[PDB]
Structures are given as structure tokens and as C-alpha cells.
Amino acid sequence: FMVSLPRMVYPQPKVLTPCRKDVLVVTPWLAPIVWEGTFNIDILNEQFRLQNTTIGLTVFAIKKYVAFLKLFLETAEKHFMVGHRVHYYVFTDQPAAVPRVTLGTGRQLSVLEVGVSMRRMEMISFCERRFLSEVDYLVCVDVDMEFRDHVGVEILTPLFGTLHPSFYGSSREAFTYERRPQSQAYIPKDEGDFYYMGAFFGGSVQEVQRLTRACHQAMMVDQANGIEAVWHDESHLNKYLLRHKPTKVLSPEYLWDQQLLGWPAVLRKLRFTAVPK
Amino acid sequence: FMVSLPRMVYPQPKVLTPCRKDVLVVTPWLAPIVWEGTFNIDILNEQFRLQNTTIGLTVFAIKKYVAFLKLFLETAEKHFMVGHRVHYYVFTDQPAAVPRVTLGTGRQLSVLEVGVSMRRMEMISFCERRFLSEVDYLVCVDVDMEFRDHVGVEILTPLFGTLHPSFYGSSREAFTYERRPQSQAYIPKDEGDFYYMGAFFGGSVQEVQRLTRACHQAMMVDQANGIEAVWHDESHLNKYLLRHKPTKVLSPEYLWDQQLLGWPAVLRKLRFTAVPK
Ligand SMILES: CCCCCCO[C@@H]1O[C@H](CO)[C@H](O)[C@H](O)[C@H]1O[C@@H]1O[C@@H](C)[C@@H](O)[C@@H](O)[C@@H]1O
Ligand SMILES: CCCCCCO[C@@H]1O[C@H](CO)[C@H](O)[C@H](O)[C@H]1O[C@@H]1O[C@@H](C)[C@@H](O)[C@@H](O)[C@@H]1O
Ligand SMILES: O=c1ccn([C@@H]2O[C@H](COP(=O)(O)OP(=O)(O)O)[C@@H](O)[C@H]2O)c(=O)[nH]1
Ligand SMILES: O=c1ccn([C@@H]2O[C@H](COP(=O)(O)OP(=O)(O)O)[C@@H](O)[C@H]2O)c(=O)[nH]1
Numbered sequence: 043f044m045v046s047l048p049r050m051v052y053p054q055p056k057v058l059t060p061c062r063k064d065v066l067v068v069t070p071w072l073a074p075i076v077w078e079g080t081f082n083i084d085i086l087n088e089q090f091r092l093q094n095t096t097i098g099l100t101v102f103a104i105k106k107y108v109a110f111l112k113l114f115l116e117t118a119e120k121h122f123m124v125g126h127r128v129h130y131y132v133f134t135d136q137p138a139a140v141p142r143v144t145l146g147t148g149r150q151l152s153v154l155e156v157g158v159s160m161r162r163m164e165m166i167s168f169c170e171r172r173f174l175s176e177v178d179y180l181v182c183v184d185v186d187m188e189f190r191d192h193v194g195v196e197i198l199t200p201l202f203g204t205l206h207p208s209f210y211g212s213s214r215e216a217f218t219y220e221r222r223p224q225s226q227a228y229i230p231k232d233e234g235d236f237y238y239m240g241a242f243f244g245g246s247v248q249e250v251q252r253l254t255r256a257c258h259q260a261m262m263v264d265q266a267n268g269i270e271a272v273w274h275d276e277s278h279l280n281k282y283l284l285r286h287k288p289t290k291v292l293s294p295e296y297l298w299d300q301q302l303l304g305w306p307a308v309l310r311k312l313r314f315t316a317v318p319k
Numbered sequence: 320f321m322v323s324l325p326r327m328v329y330p331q332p333k334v335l336t337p338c339r340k341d342v343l344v345v346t347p348w349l350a351p352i353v354w355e356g357t358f359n360i361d362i363l364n365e366q367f368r369l370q371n372t373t374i375g376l377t378v379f380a381i382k383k384y385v386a387f388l389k390l391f392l393e394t395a396e397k398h399f400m401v402g403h404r405v406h407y408y409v410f411t412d413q414p415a416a417v418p419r420v421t422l423g424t425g426r427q428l429s430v431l432e433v434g435v436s437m438r439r440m441e442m443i444s445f446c447e448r449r450f451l452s453e454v455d456y457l458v459c460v461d462v463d464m465e466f467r468d469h470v471g472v473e474i475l476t477p478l479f480g481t482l483h484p485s486f487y488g489s490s491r492e493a494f495t496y497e498r499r500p501q502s503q504a505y506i507p508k509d510e511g512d513f514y515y516m517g518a519f520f521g522g523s524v525q526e527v528q529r530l531t532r533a534c535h536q537a538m539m540v541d542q543a544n545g546i547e548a549v550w551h552d553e554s555h556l557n558k559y560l561l562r563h564k565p566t567k568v569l570s571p572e573y574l575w576d577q578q579l580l581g582w583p584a585v586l587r588k589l590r591f592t593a594v595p596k
């Protein structure tokens with residue numbers, strides 16, 4: 043049950059005025075594509091706070107990648123779901139190397155010790171019971187990253203993927219999908235909506251568990267058949283999201299590499315960005 | 320659980336090409352606004368058929384308005400959810416005046432006898448148990464109407480309203496919301512997203528029952544306080560949708576009066592239109 047929004051004073055949306063004329067802001071299956079200028083964050087914050095929404099964030103920091111945690115977590119505290127309940131789940135082989143990061147109120151961090159290709163999907167799909175009990179949404183991201191600007195409840199939806207920053211302007215035949223028919227991740231040259239990057243996806247706990255289970259099972263089939271998809275779990279993620287359309291798509295604001303790609307006009311904000319490695 | 324879509328061959332959506340540059344296609348709370356050119360109906364048909372979706376359509380034909388049923392139902396058969404399961408619920412004081420209309424396969428009609436202002440919301444919110452058992456979505460429309468073009472699963476969502484054709488270009492201070500603070504339907508001049516018309520709303524059975532219950536209760540409060548809202552159940556519908564944002568909004572393609580308003584450039588299709596009275 044959703045209680046009523048309070049009175050709010052904000053600019054009227056005008057039907058004959060779009061703000062964004064330069065980009066596609068809805069998919070052909072009527073999923074919003076999230077760009078700056080498409081959402082009033084005050085309305086969304088109200089909606090999600092009224093539901094006492096809890097967001098889980100999973101991040102893997104294995105071997106040398108524990109070095110990325112301090113900046114990742116400190117910038118998450120500045121930019122990720124501020125004002126909402128957040129539970130970070132840090133998966134690592136070195137619990138003692140997790141930096142001591144000071145968290146805002148309503149935010150928690152759990153260190154989960156693990157003993158590459160298949161680990162993340164397998165692990166997320168097994169934390170199944172814990173996540174269902176503790177959070178409403180799960181967000182699954184790479185650690186070799188920093189938050190530079192707002193990443194908030196505008197992303198939340200049953201299932202989302204993020205447009206890969208190298209391919210948002212590309213034709214589908216150029217997408218680096220797995221192209222060998224012997225792989226479960228196979229996508230022919232005449233199929234595909236978008237190329238989603240494996241570094242940022244999420245959704246409701248149920249839908250994320252469905253996605254990660256499916257990708258894990260498909261990767262195991264490939265392993266049994268002696269084939270490894272060209273971009274590993276990302277290839278499988280792409281196959282899944284082709285066959286199970288996401289209910290929102292994040293624009294490349296949400297996954298950017300400024301060193302590699304600069305700051306194009308179409309990006310009004312660079313929110314979550316690659317750290318050089 | 321949602322099974323996988325089959326392979327489909329269709330045009331690639333391109334992020335740097337929107338089709339509709341002339342209109343707002345997403346609300347500030349990230350609800351799609353449904354216009355022609357925003358959806359691939361083949362993808363949506365697949366998604367909803369895979370769930371064996373059943374759509375209920377409620378329509379009231381009381382006193383002289385039974386005369387509108389033949390054209391309403393015959394054109395619904397040509398245009399409304401064709402290929403999907405449909406259950407029409409015709410509420411009337413004259414069951415014998417309901418015309419014999421031939422239905423396509425998978426489609427059913429029930430005549431519900433009833434013995435104005437408050438009837439529709441009260442009645443819909445009591446058919447509660449029946450609707451929950453028989454249909455997945457409910458669509459609630461005026462009878463003094465005809466279908467001229469496709470109205471399909473692109474509308475389906477937990478909660479939708481439709482932009483009133485006289486007000487989609489108006490500023491909110493011009494909206495004919497109830498403006499007296501003594502009414503439960505009251506909306507001040509600095510609030511409001513859109514003016515929704517009472518002739519076409521819907522959603523999941525649960526959300527429609529919530530809306531109609533709330534509007535019925537608010538109308539009863541007004542009655543007890545000796546006030547009737549300026550546009551009756553439409554005023555209440557507008558108050559509800561201000562405080563409970565719809566998850567899709569239908570463009571005026573879905574509720575048009577060609578005699579009154581012609582055929583503006585912004586409307587590529589006239590789907591569901593007023594019959595002169
Ligand atoms: C000099 C490296 C050139 C990389 C350009 C293309 O990107 C790669 O695209 C692949 C798919 O075809 C995979 O998604 C890689 O993860 C991605 O490289 C990753 O994401 C990119 C955004 C960069 O941050 C890159 O350093 C990183 O390894
Ligand atoms: C000559 C009549 C002028 C009516 C113009 C404005 O519309 C009315 O708007 C009101 C709200 O302010 C209510 O929604 C009425 O139902 C609507 O009139 C209804 O819907 C309209 C689209 C027309 O079909 C009208 O005949 C019908 O009574
Ligand atoms: O030695 C490693 C390699 C990978 N990863 C995790 O797997 C993610 C994906 O790897 P990487 O960032 O190297 O991939 P790329 O950005 O090149 O796709 C990383 O962000 C880490 O979360 C890790 O923890 N340790
Ligand atoms: O005598 C009446 C008056 C109204 N209605 C029902 O209530 C709806 C709303 O009334 P109307 O269409 O007259 O309103 P308007 O289009 O002027 O808003 C009609 O379409 C009918 O479904 C009816 O059945 N009999």
C-alpha cells in the first residue's frame with residue numbers, strides 16, 4: 043500500500059515541451075531511459091521514502107582491487123542514495139584490507155568473505171535469503187569506479203541495465219555481443235536493443251536473483267561445452283536483457299570513462315565513472 | 320515469473336534519435352506518456368501474451384445511454400486489445416436493451432444490472448471480488464464513445480490516467496480542478512501535473528479498486544458536507560492522481576473529440592473518440 047504524497051510545489055510538466063529533444067528517453071517497450079532533465083528528484087524521493095526503501099549495493103574487491111574500495115565507498119557516501127537506507131555488501135578475499143569508511147546515518151556495511159569469470163553472478167544468486175530479508179532493491183556495480191554526482195532513486199525499478207558508454211551511438215551489428223552460436227550468450231547480428239555494460243545493473247531483489255541465476259546457469263552450460271563468452275558475464279547479461287526487457291535503462295551518465303571518452307554535450311552530468319587502472 | 324521472449328527482428332532503437340521530439344513522452348516521475356511512435360506493439364504484445372493477460376473493460380449504460388452500446392462494443396471488437404483476453408462488464412438498468420454483439424474468440428461480455436454522480440466509483444470498488452478473480456487489468460471508460468484505431472496493451476500498467484483533450488496544452492491554473500477548500504477534491508492553483516479526463520482510466524485490479532474506493536469515500540465526505548465537486552467523479556480522480564502518481568499517462572490520442580477539436584498535427588492517430596450527443 044502506497045500512502046498519499048504531500049502537497050508539493052514544483053514546475054508543471056508541459057506536454058508540448060519536452061526538455062530532452064536530443065536523446066531517446068523511453069524504450070520501444072515503454073521503459074524510461076534515465077537522463078538528467080527527465081526526472082524531478084523531489085517527487086521520486088518522496089515516493090521512495092514513503093515506502094522506507096532500502097537499497098543494497100554489491101561490490102566485489104578481490105586480490106589487488108581492494109585498493110579501489112576507499113574512493114568507491116567514500117564517494118558513494120557523497121552521492122549514492124543519500125537520504126535513503128543503504129546496505130553495502132562488500133565481497134572480498136581480504137576482509138582486513140577493507141578500509142574503515144565513516145557512514146551517514148541509516149547506512150550499513152557488511153564484509154562478506156569469499157575464497158574469476160563466474161564468481162559475481164554465482165555469489166549474488168549464494169546470498170539469496172539474506173538479500174530478500176534485508177533490502178528492497180539490489181544494485182550491482184564494479185569497484186574500479188567513483189561517484190562524481192547524484193545516483194539516486196530515479197534508477198530503482200524491477201529490472202535495470204545501463205548503456206555501455208562506448209556503444210550508445212553504435213548500430214547493433216557493431217555491438218560486441220557473443221556471436222558464436224555454440225554459446226548460450228549468442229545474439230545474431232539482426233537482434234539487440236542496446237549494449238548494456240556489466241559494471242552497473244540492478245532491480246528488485248527478486249528480479250536481480252532471477253537475472254544472476256539465469257546468467258550463472260548459462261555460464262555453467264558454456265563451461266561444460268568448452269566455450270567462454272567474449273565478454274564473460276557481460277555477454278550473458280546482454281542475452282538476458284534482450285530476452286527479458288529491463289523496466290528502466292540508465293543512460294551513460296551512470297557509467298562513464300572520462301579519460302577514454304571525454305565529456306560529450308549529450309551528458310549533462312557524469313555520475314559514476316571509471317578510475318584509471 | 321516471466322518466460323523469455325522469442326527471437327524477434329525489428330528496428331533498433333537509437334539513443335541519439337528520438338522519434339517524438341514534439342511532445343513530452345515521460346513524466347517527471349518517470350512514467351511513460353503513451354503516444355504513437357513511442358512503442359513497438361509487437362514487443363508489447365509478446366510480453367503481455369506470454370502472461371496470458373486478461374483485460375476487463377467496464378462501461379455504464381444507464382437510461383438513454385444504452386443507445387451508445389452497439390457502436391461502442393462493435394468498434395471495441397475492431398480495436399480494443401485484439402488478440403488478448405477481454406471481459407466486458409456492461410452495467411445497465413436495462414439488460415434487455417443491451418445489443419447482441421458478436422465477439423471474437425477469447426472475449427466475453429457480462430451484463431450487470433444496477434438500479435448518478437457516485438454510481439460508477441461505488442460500483443467498481445461492489446464488484447471487488449469478481450474482478451480480482453476474473454481479470455488482471457481493469458479499464459474504465461465512458462460509453463458515449465467509439466474506437467477508431469488501435470487501443471492495446473501499451474496502456475497497461477499498475478495505474479493510468481488519460482490527458483483531457485481540452486487541457487493538454489494548458490497551464491495548471493487554467494485546469495478545472497475543484498478549487499473550493501471545503502471539498503475533498505480541492506487542488507490549489509500552484510499544484511497539479513495534468514488534467515486527467517474521467518472517461519478513461521485503469522490499471523491493475525488492485526490499483527483500480529484502490530482509486531475507486533478512495534474517490535467513493537471522498538465523494539461521500541463531500542456529500543455529508545453539502546458540497547459537490549465541480550466535475551463530479553473527475554474532480555476526485557484528479558485529486559487521487561495528483562497524490563498517487565500514475566505509472567503511465569495516455570496521450571489525448573486515447574480520448575479525443577474531433578467535432579470539438581479537429582485533428583491537430585501532434586495527433587498521429589485518433590484512437591477513442593466522442594460520439595456527438
Ligand atoms: C583502452 C580500453 C578500450 C575499451 C573500450 C571498450 O570498453 C570495453 O568494452 C568491452 C565490450 O566491447 C567490455 O565491456 C570492456 O569491459 C570495456 O572496457 C572497460 O570499460 C571501458 C569504458 C574502459 O573503462 C576500459 O578501460 C575498461 O576496461
Ligand atoms: C461544447 C462542450 C465544450 C466542452 C469542452 C471541455 O470539455 C469538458 O471539460 C470538462 C472539464 O473542464 C469536463 O471534463 C467535461 O466532461 C468535458 O466535456 C465533455 O468532453 C469534451 C471533450 C466534449 O466531448 C464534451 O461534449 C463533453 O461533454
Ligand atoms: O582481480 C580482480 C578482477 C576483477 N574484480 C572485480 O570484477 C569487476 C570487473 O572487473 P574489471 O573492473 O577489471 O572489468 P572492466 O572494467 O575491464 O570490465 C571489478 O570492478 C571488481 O569488482 C576483482 O575484484 N578483482
Ligand atoms: O444518463 C446517463 C448519464 C451518464 N451515464 C454514464 O456516465 C458516463 C459519463 O457521462 P457523460 O458521457 O454524459 O459525461 P461527459 O462526456 O459529458 O463527461 C457516460 O458515458 C455513461 O457511461 C449513463 O450511463 N447514463
Ligand SMILES: [Mn+2]
Nearest residue numbers: 184185186241
Ligand atoms: Mn570495471
Ligand SMILES: [Mn+2]
Nearest residue numbers: 461462463518
Ligand atoms: Mn462521455
